[PDB]
């Protein structure tokens, strides 16, 4: 098994489908990564995550370095052994949560729930045993000004080189893991270009598009993807961080994105929102109290084979943990079925038709 | 498959082991019934409940009549179909929660979260599709006086006859379900006797011992069981309601009890308490933060095959739903392994030795 091999099997327009082969397994692209912030995909055993079709999950450097601790996880055998997921794990670098959750120099950032630098982030991700390591970046809030966008971007590019060097200095990491760079530059075409050029000069295994899904709206996000994804190396995976709703994912694939992560299916499942091919529904609504149909009429997941809307409605209204478990399994399974339909339609040269058919029914 | 057939395969002293055959399956005795108050055994899929070894679960008339409603559950196909458990279900009658949770004549009780009578309780349990129906009783708080104990007991005996008649008037219920009477009389030998005599004159499929596990302490509970269980028909199952801790169960079996239910393994599992053969542990304690051993070194459950104390410690301290799921599966599996060891040791004529060996290690 190779360290990291991305192969594009089929294209349609800007959309691609294929595989990333890694030592712990194969990732089918376009891929959706369930988020496992605190070494768990919330309310699911790892076997259940796998059963839904997930090939890879996401963990977070910031959360795990605080609880339970990166050195502690390494002493316990690594994140895979710790949480019981033996397939690839991508770890975000911590740059976003340092900004978004905690309370800043060229060397790095100090904060209160600790210090984080490019070199420390890579070391933490090494200690976790991450398969796809993200470069450590400096994030700026939305809506950023041109000055704050450029200044965050250029520092992020200097930090990308430092991340690259720290990764390459760790023999075990360099031989067994992969490293992705993060393109910044907010909604400004020029800065996105300067960012892409700098990352391509350094050379990474994959290229993430950062700085989106922070409140910009789908139109603007698509506008930025329109010019930003062509700037990235075509022969490497393209990862859109933090995205997103099902229609966001379809449109991002139409624009060249290969990888996705977001908390929406897990978080909104626990809140009562279930995704269906006819759009989301809120299972708490009184109209479901005696609905014997499954959450979705076509879904193949174990929840839709076994339980009714009426039962899940009862569980969520009662605050029952099984409600959260079932909603989450169905939502993650729905997302994986979406990615499967995207992959098959690109492979078959009918993704354009699938996207139109998906949107017409989903927004009917 | 028979409606209800209790067969004692082996005895040792007052202890018995055997089977209850019912239309939806066989119940191995002594049996522990996981509690599924709101049509779910908290944080477990029914398949997981079955995987732990449970033959039967407990539901509650009081909770389900309020949410989601007994007529509604019947319209949706019954409790078994609703929650996805196709094996026997025993429903408590609601008499305890009417007292313990809500805010009283010879006819029945009116309360605020509705009315409950012997006839209405049996009808609700019919609507739920319960396999073992409990007679509706009038409970009195602990510590009851001799006057309040006798008055509650005698009314409960009149209500037991009314429960019997309502059950027998419902042909589908009488042909497919079983009916248990509840012995009351608090800690008073004379009243326990009068209660036992009245129930035996009416005739029931099984006999529950009510009015215990309400704060009386194990010594007093055992003292009451010492004279109360011999009063019940020997050839019928003996159900101790609401009990209990593992040592409570062993001592109750030594005194003739065949069936048990309690929220302890589920509720205290979510609170961080895990049962082991060396006694309970609280997994939140800092001493488990780097403990790679399973919750219990001998346990056969899926949790102890896959995850460490250290990981479960992290989950429970983080408030993660998977923490509750794993603790609960292990605790219910531990209880079922206890019942299995009890059944095997009685069958083999070494239960006395097992009880001594269990207590010496569990309280070491
Ligand atoms: N550049 C990073 N290290 N992280 C990152 C980037 C874009 C994101 N968008 C959201 N949305 C919520 N979360 C994100 C995290
Ligand atoms: N007689 C009934 N219908 N119910 C009943 C009886 C004894 C119990 N003890 C506890 N302990 C908490 N719960 C119990 C429920
Ligand atoms: Zn489903
Ligand atoms: Zn176990």
Q: What domains sit in chain B, N to C, each tagged with a CATH number? A: 1-364 (3.20.20.105)
Active-site hit among B131, B248, B258, B261: B261
CA–CA distance, A90 with A298 (Å, rounded to integer): 30
Binding site for Zn(2+): which residues of A? 299, 301, 304, 330
Active-site hit among B92, B131, B258, B296: B92
* 3-state secondary structure (DSSP) of residue B186: coil
User: Ligand 1, from A61, A214, A266: best to mutate by most atoms within 8 Å of Cβ?
Assistant: A214
The DSSP element (H or E) to which A92 belongs, if any, is: strand A89-92
The DSSP element (H or E) to which B7 belongs, if any, is: strand B4-12
Closest ligand to residue A276's CA: 3
Q: Which residues contact A211 (CB under 8 A, 6 or more apart)?
A: A139, A140, A142, A144, A149, A184, A185, A186
Tokens matching residue B170: 């419902």
A216 CA: distance to closest CA in chain B (Å): 31
Interchain pair B44, A322: CB under 8 A? yes
Order the strands of the A206-209 sheet from edge to edge: A31-33, A259-261, A238-240, A206-209, A178-183, A132-134, A89-92, A57-60
CA–CA distance, A84 with A79 (Å, rounded to integer): 8
B184 labelled binding-site residue? yes
Active-site hit among A205, A258, A261, A296: A261
The separation between CA A144 and the C-alpha centre of its own chain, rounded to angstroms, equals: 22
What residues flank ligand 2, with Cβ below 6 Å? Answer: B 92-93, 95-96, 134, 137, 139, 182, 210-211, 213-214, 241-242
CA–CA distance, B15 with B51 (Å, rounded to integer): 26
- Answer left, alpha or beta for residue B78, where phi above 0 means left and psi between -120 and 50 means alpha: left
CA–CA distance, A243 with A251 (Å, rounded to integer): 11
Tokens matching residue B208: 């529950």
Q: What is the 3-state secondary structure (H, E, C) of B70-108?
A: HHHHHHCCCHHHHHCCCCCEEEECCHHHHHHCCCCCCCC
Tokens matching residue B225: 């069981």
Q: Could you identify the residue written with the tokens 């909603």?
A: A327
CA–CA distance, B241 with B243 (Å, rounded to integer): 6
Tokens matching residue A249: 């994912």
CA–CA distance, B146 with B149 (Å, rounded to integer): 5
The separation between CA B184 and the C-alpha centre of its own chain, rounded to angstroms, equals: 16
Residue B363 DSSP class = T
CA–CA distance, B95 with B104 (Å, rounded to integer): 11
Name the pairing type of β-strands B281-282 and B273-274.
antiparallel
The separation between CA B186 and the C-alpha centre of its own chain, rounded to angstroms, equals: 18
Measured between beta carbons, the chain A residues lying within 8 angstroms of B317 are 67
Closest ligand to residue A53's CA: 3
The DSSP element (H or E) to which A281 belongs, if any, is: strand A281-282
Residues 66..125 of B with a Cβ closer than 8 Å to A: which?
Answer: 67-68, 72, 75-77, 82-84
Residues 152..211 of B with a Cβ closer than 8 Å to A: which?
Answer: none
Tokens matching residue A232: 């990235």
CA–CA distance, B131 with A221 (Å, rounded to integer): 57
Resolution at which this structure was determined, Å: 1.7
- Answer left, alpha or beta for residue A41, where phi above 0 means left and psi between -120 and 50 means alpha: beta
* 3-state secondary structure (DSSP) of residue A324: helix
Binding site: which residues of A? 92-96, 137, 184, 211, 299, 301, 304, 330
The DSSP element (H or E) to which B302 belongs, if any, is: helix B302-306
Q: Give me the torsion for CA of B196, B201, B207, B211, rounded to 10°.
A: -40
Total count of residues recorded for chain B: 364
Catalytic: A235? no
The separation between CA A123 and the C-alpha centre of its own chain, rounded to angstroms, equals: 21
A287–B contact, CB cutoff 8 A: no
CA–CA distance, B13 with B93 (Å, rounded to integer): 32
Task: Write out the DSSP string of A166-184.
Answer: HHHH-HHHHHH-EEEEEE-
Cis peptide bond prior to B23, omega within 30° of 0: no
Q: Could you identify the residue written with the tokens 């395969």?
A: B9
Q: How far is CA A55 from CA A58, A117, A223, A332, B172, in A?
A: 11, 30, 29, 12, 50
Q: Could you identify the residue written with the tokens 């129906």?
A: B133
CA–CA distance, A124 with A69 (Å, rounded to integer): 9
Q: What is the 3-state secondary structure (H, E, C) of A129-162?
A: CCCEEECCCCCCCCCCCHHHHHHHHHHHHHHHHH
Measured between beta carbons, the chain B residues lying within 8 angstroms of A292 are 76-77
Specify the residue with its C-alpha closest to ligand 1, atom 15. A96
CA–CA distance, A237 with A258 (Å, rounded to integer): 6
| Closest alpha carbon to A325 in A344, A338, A311, A340 | A311
Q: How many CB atoms lie within 10 A of CB A276?
A: 19
Contact B214, B241 (CB under 8 A): no
Closest ligand to residue A334's CA: 3
- Answer left, alpha or beta for residue B258, where phi above 0 means left and psi between -120 and 50 means alpha: alpha
Catalytic: A261? yes
Cis peptide bond prior to A143, omega within 30° of 0: yes
CA–CA distance, A293 with A274 (Å, rounded to integer): 13
Tokens matching residue A217: 């709206």
Task: Write out the DSSP string of B342-356.
Answer: HHHHHHTT-HHHHHH
Q: Could you identify the residue written with the tokens 């031989």?
A: A175
Half-sphere exposure in the Cβ direction for A175 (13 Å, CA): 3
Contact B163, B135 (CB under 8 A): yes
Tokens matching residue B213: 């596990």
Half-sphere exposure in the Cβ direction for A335 (13 Å, CA): 33
Contact B54, B35 (CB under 8 A): no
CA–CA distance, A166 with A116 (Å, rounded to integer): 14
Method: X-ray
The DSSP element (H or E) to which A190 belongs, if any, is: helix A189-202
Contact A102, A113 (CB under 8 A): yes
**Beta-bridge partners for B191:** none
Tokens matching residue A206: 């994959």
| Closest alpha carbon to A363 in A252, A244, A294, A277 | A277
| Closest alpha carbon to B214 in B163, B276, B262 | B262
CA–CA distance, B360 with A99 (Å, rounded to integer): 55
Tokens matching residue B206: 């099984």
Task: Write out the DSSP string of B29-75.
Answer: ESEEE-B-TTSS-TT--HHHHHHTT-S-EEEEHHHHHHTT-HHHHHH
Tokens matching residue A60: 């977070």
Half-sphere exposure in the Cβ direction for B61 (13 Å, CA): 32
B315–A contact, CB cutoff 8 A: yes
Contact A163, A131 (CB under 8 A): no
């Amino acid at each position: 098994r190779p360290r990291f091999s991305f192969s594009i099997a089929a294209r349609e327009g800007k959309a691609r489908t294929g595989t990333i082969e890694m030592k712990r397994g194969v990732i089918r692209t376009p891929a959706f990564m369930p988020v496992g912030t605190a070494a768990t995909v919330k309310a699911l055993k790892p076997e259940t995550v796998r059963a839904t079709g997930a090939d890879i999950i996401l963990g977070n450097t910031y959360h795990l370095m605080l609880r339970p601790g990166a050195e502690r996880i390494a002493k316990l055998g690594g994140l895979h052994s710790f949480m019981g997921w033996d397939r690839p794990i991508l770890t975000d670098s911590g740059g976003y949560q340092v900004m978004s959750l905690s309370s800043q120099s060229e060397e790095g950032v100090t904060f209160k729930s600790h210090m984080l630098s490019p070199e420390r982030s890579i070391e933490i991700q090494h200690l976790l045993g991450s398969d796809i390591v993200m470069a450590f970046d400096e994030c700026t809030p939305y809506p950023a000004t041109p000055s704050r966008a450029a200044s965050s971007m250029e520092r992020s590019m200097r930090w990308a080189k430092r991340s690259r060097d720290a990764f390459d200095s760790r023999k075990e990491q360099a031989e067994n893991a992969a490293l992705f760079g993060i393109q910044q530059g907010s909604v400004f075409e020029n800065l996105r270009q300067q960012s892409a050029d700098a990352l391509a000069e350094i050379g990474f295994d994959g290229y993430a598009v950062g700085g989106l899904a922070v409140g910009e709206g789908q139109d603007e996000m698509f506008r930025v993807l329109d010019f930003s994804v062509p700037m990235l190396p075509d022969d490497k995976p393209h990862y859109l961080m933090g995205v997103g709703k099902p229609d966001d994912i379809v449109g991002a694939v139409e624009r060249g994105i290969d990888m996705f992560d977001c908390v929406l299916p897990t978080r909104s499942g626990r809140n009562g929102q279930a995704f269906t091919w006819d759009g989301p529904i809120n299972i708490r609504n009184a109209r479901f109290s005696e609905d014997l149909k499954p959450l979705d009429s076509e879904c193949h997941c174990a929840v839709c084979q076994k339980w009714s809307r009426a039962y899940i409605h009862h569980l969520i209204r009662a605050g029952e943990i099984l409600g959260a478990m079932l909603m989450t399994e169905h939502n993650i399974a729905f997302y994986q079925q979406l990615m499967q339909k995207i992959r098959d339609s690109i492979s078959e040269g009918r993704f354009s038709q699938f996207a139109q058919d998906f949107r017409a029914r989903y927004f009917a």
